[PDB]
């Protein structure tokens with residue numbers, strides 16, 4: 152006859168909500184006695200069988216720019232990073248004035264000797280010690296033309312908390328798992344432009360392998376694409392929104408260094424010892440990064456022919472960074488526990504006008520691109536609340552046989568009748584890397600209650 | 612089928628799978644956050660169970676209530692609802708009317724229970 | 735009695751002691767552990783009660799289902815099971831096949847509810 | 858009318874107001890106290906629900922149980938009990954004999970369930 156309402160429990164309907172998430176790590180990350188920095192004592196392990204079920208005919212809108220897991224991941228990384236430097240050595244008795252000269256006979260033109268006095272394990276006795284501090288960690292306090300007085304940089308503003316020499320900065324993968332009563336929708340569309348509907352949504356509980364790499368201006372190890380180069384942006388109208396280029400073919404990049412002596416152990420009290428840079432044996436060279444020439448050339452050509460779809464009659468150009476200090480204009484990362492800040496002058500020096508150039512030469516692979524750069528030791532990252540460190544050095548030489556995944560670009564402001572616009576690389580906020588690694592997923596809440604029309608009559 | 616096996620399937624065929632989406636509602640730095648989330652999940656399930664039990668539909672998945680359905684709410688034929696539509700569009704176009712439906716179910720349960728105690732007391 | 739009074743007695747004599755045993759499922763450094771233990775006790779009880787509530791045996795200590803009993807699970811006679819076997823080795827023997835029984839009760843409950851819905855909507 | 862509508866009224870007058878008095882059982886430094894009060898509310902509601910659910914009176918006010926009433930608990934007639942005395946002093950004089958009563962209802966409910974088991978298995 153007429154419609155009578157009936158209640159249903161166990162109904163698959165969805166809403167958008169913001170809740171905290173869990174961890175998930177591999178089984179090999181718990182047998183290590185170095186305790187890592189994230190996945191040994193806090194994060195829970197996962198099962199070795201990630202079940203994924205594809206849904207039939209559902210279309211769901213995705214917005215990777217207005218996301219909750221990016222902000223939660225950033226807050227969790229910041230909090231877990233600040234909690235891992237509390238039981239470590241603090242370099243408060245190192246703000247004494249340093250007397251610094253050239254590095255012996257035949258100076259290296261990059262380090263200063265910087266001999267000082269320090270308090271030993273006895274509170275009365277003091278001893279004269281020496282090191283080799285890097286030049287960007289040395290500030291010339293002066294009142295006249297004095298070339299022998301120097302001090303450390305982090306004693307001026309806030310703290311000198313050294314990292315512990317047991318943990319490591321190795322980026323092992325982690326997975327984010329939704330809590331009970333929540334699911335994660337993942338879009339499998341290959342032509343996903345970042346915002347809009349998706350028609351191959353699959354429901355998963357735990358995310359795939361995410362490596363929280365510390366990098367700016369250029370993306371390190373990460374997940375590749377499937378079909379072609381993908382452009383990620385939210386408006387593509389103004390010049391103040393960072394655009395992400397997601398690649399398809401990796402390009403090999405290595406970074407090397409000359410030798411050092413050892414970790415010179417200097418005591419500043421009971422138990423608190425720090426490892427400074429000792430001597431340098433052998434000849435001194437530069438710390439450089441090598442990138443293949445023809446792979447970078449046809450990769451940038453592929454980026455050009457794919458980016459020409461959004462600009463039909465305009466040529467693209469590249470040049471240097473748009474000014475600033477050391478920390479923002481250089482591609483910065485870390486390897487083996489030592490940080491690198493490297494100039495990108497020889498990578499973004501070119502232009503594309505729409506005419507493709509084919510590179511067919513087998514013997515031309517010998518030519519490479521070299522990036523010469525220096526090393527810092529005190530890191531002021533996260534653009535605030537960073538808990539200013541002092542990275543301990545490594546004894547021998549190191550290698551950085553790495554992989555490249557994406558690029559971060561920013562358009563410059565043009566003038567009238569400017570048909571040739573430029574794209575300069577820039578980093579800035581840390582959220583861009585984890586936003587590039589979390590475009591697929593979206594947290595979702597299920598409501599098991601519902602109503603439906605039928606002809607059910609409850610008996611009395 | 613596990614999570615959301617019939618989230619876009621046939622309306623008549625989505626009534627055979629409510630058990631698997633209802634079986635799994637409970638299954639220092641991070642000693643408080645997961646605790647708060649777990650207690651929140653427990654109270655979400657308990658609120659759902661109490662809301663089911665407040666109109667006499669506890670322990671039964673598909674329960675029936677004698678309150679009628681007004682023509683100003685859906686005005687659509689039953690056959691193509693149960694054979695063509697899905698749950699998500701139904702939640703899209705019914706969720707603005709849910710509170711008065713819940714109130715009607717509560718009033719109908721109150722009337723049914725008051726007739727039940729009147730019949731028990733008069734006998 | 736008390737905590738598991740008929741913990742080793744006859745199978746038949748252990749069916750009249752369900753009430754006095756299931757009643758006790760809810761009754762700084764040393765402040766986190768007590769609260770966590772209380773929350774996980776609530777977790778275990780709510781999981782057990784929900785699992786009883788899926789297959790239509792909510793609020794009943796002893797409930798009967800209409801699923802057939804396959805002989806390949808036990809292959810044993812009823813009389814010596816109910817008069818000679820303690821619950822412990824019985825649960826040890828059936829522990830290799832509990833998920834099949836849970837799925838069969840779930841499917842039988844859903845099928846019985848759909849037949850009841852068809853019979854009730856037929857009128 | 859929410860909490861304690863007729864807390865000092867007649868025994869028989871409190872029977873018609875039971876449907877409105879028991880409706881609100883669930884409806885840094887100052888975050889831990891909120892968590893503890895939240896968990897304690899969950900404990901109270903779940904304990905009350907299971908204790909009402911052991912002796913077969915789940916989701917039903919004014920439940921009748923076939924256990925006989927012993928004369929050693931009150932030894933006074935029901936007329937002046939139901940039209941003379943309020944709830945509080947009656948609870949004061951009944952509080953010494955609550956565990957024996959709870960055990961008697963538990964045993965009666967379990968025996969009733971076994972009788973229903975034998976009756977349905979007799980067919």
Ligand SMILES: *[C@@H]1O[C@H](CO)[C@@H](O[C@@H]2O[C@H](CO)[C@@H](O[C@@H]3O[C@H](CO[C@H]4O[C@H](CO)[C@@H](O)[C@H](O)[C@@H]4O)[C@@H](O)[C@H](O[C@H]4O[C@H](CO)[C@@H](O)[C@H](O)[C@@H]4O)[C@@H]3O)[C@H](O)[C@H]2NC(C)=O)[C@H](O)[C@H]1NC(C)=O
Pocket residue numbers: 185319321322364371372484485486487488550551552553554
């Ligand atoms: C992007 O991806 C690349 C490749 O996946 C990563 O490169 C790896 O980086 C890690 C560290 O960042 C390297 O691990 C280190 O290797 C050093 C040399 O390894 C050789 O020698 C050892 C024996 O000494 C052999 O077992 C090994 O197979 C190699 O032949 C080691 O000396 C290092 O040891 C240090 O760490 C351990 C544990 O923390 C300490 O106990 C030691 O005392 C010492 O301090 C370390 O194991 C790894 O070798 C690199 N891979 C390759 C192929 O070279 C990038 O790091 C990654 N990220 C970025 C940003 O580029």
Ligand SMILES: *[C@@H]1O[C@H](CO)[C@@H](O[C@@H]2O[C@H](CO)[C@@H](O)[C@H](O)[C@H]2NC(C)=O)[C@H](O)[C@H]1NC(C)=O
Pocket residue numbers: 254255264265266281283430431
């Ligand atoms: C930095 O200066 C110190 C002191 O001026 C140097 O330490 C001396 O090194 C010579 C070797 O040339 C030794 O003979 C002395 O005994 C050292 N004096 C000490 C330890 O008090 C140190 O070599 C200089 N650093 C560098 C890199 O040359």
Ligand SMILES: *[C@@H]1O[C@H](CO)[C@@H](O[C@@H]2O[C@H](CO)[C@@H](O)[C@H](O)[C@H]2NC(C)=O)[C@H](O)[C@H]1NC(C)=O
Pocket residue numbers: 290291292307308
């Ligand atoms: C102590 O820190 C302050 C910043 O809080 C320094 O002020 C500026 O520092 C930058 C970075 O080296 C310089 O480029 C500027 O020239 C500094 N001055 C101004 C007015 O911006 C300050 O110089 C530091 N103290 C010393 C002695 O160097």
Ligand SMILES: *[C@@H]1O[C@H](CO)[C@@H](O)[C@H](O)[C@H]1NC(C)=O
Pocket residue numbers: 207208619620621
């Ligand atoms: C999804 O809906 C379309 C619309 O009729 C239907 O043809 C298709 O079979 C559905 N998919 C599944 C898996 O049922």
Ligand SMILES: *[C@@H]1O[C@H](CO)[C@@H](O)[C@H](O)[C@H]1NC(C)=O
Pocket residue numbers: 248249250266267268277278279
């Ligand atoms: C440091 O302490 C020593 C004590 O031996 C003293 O001789 C010296 O003048 C002090 N200052 C410097 C700058 O070395």
Ligand SMILES: *[C@@H]1O[C@H](CO)[C@@H](O)[C@H](O)[C@H]1NC(C)=O
Pocket residue numbers: 205339351
């Ligand atoms: C959706 O993604 C899955 C992932 O394996 C794939 O198998 C399937 O073909 C995709 N759907 C379509 C229509 O391509």
Ligand SMILES: *[C@@H]1O[C@H](CO)[C@@H](O)[C@H](O)[C@H]1NC(C)=O
Pocket residue numbers: 386388389
């Ligand atoms: C950003 O996008 C909105 C709509 O997509 C548009 O109206 C607005 O003009 C854009 N911003 C700029 C600076 O053009």
Ligand SMILES: *[C@@H]1O[C@H](CO)[C@@H](O)[C@H](O)[C@H]1NC(C)=O
Pocket residue numbers: 468469470471501573
């Ligand atoms: C890049 O920026 C510099 C800054 O002075 C400018 O001179 C140059 O024309 C720009 N373009 C190229 C292709 O170098």
Ligand SMILES: *[C@@H]1O[C@H](CO)[C@@H](O)[C@H](O)[C@H]1NC(C)=O
Pocket residue numbers: 471477480481494495496
């Ligand atoms: C990078 O290299 C260019 C040319 O080699 C040079 O002009 C510039 O000063 C270097 N440094 C930075 C931070 O751009």
Ligand SMILES: *[C@@H]1O[C@H](CO)[C@@H](O)[C@H](O)[C@H]1NC(C)=O
Pocket residue numbers: 496500501
């Ligand atoms: C860029 O490339 C041109 C062409 O090879 C070269 O002449 C120039 O030195 C390069 N570097 C800069 C900073 O322009």
Ligand SMILES: *[C@@H]1O[C@H](CO)[C@@H](O)[C@H](O)[C@H]1NC(C)=O
Pocket residue numbers: 548549550
């Ligand atoms: C640098 O270290 C690697 C091993 O980490 C070694 O194979 C290589 O020979 C070293 N470089 C030099 C110049 O010795």
Ligand SMILES: *[C@@H]1O[C@H](CO)[C@@H](O)[C@H](O)[C@H]1NC(C)=O
Pocket residue numbers: 372373401403553554555
């Ligand atoms: C990067 O590329 C090299 C060779 O192309 C490969 O061996 C390596 O596994 C790649 N990195 C990752 C993280 O897959």
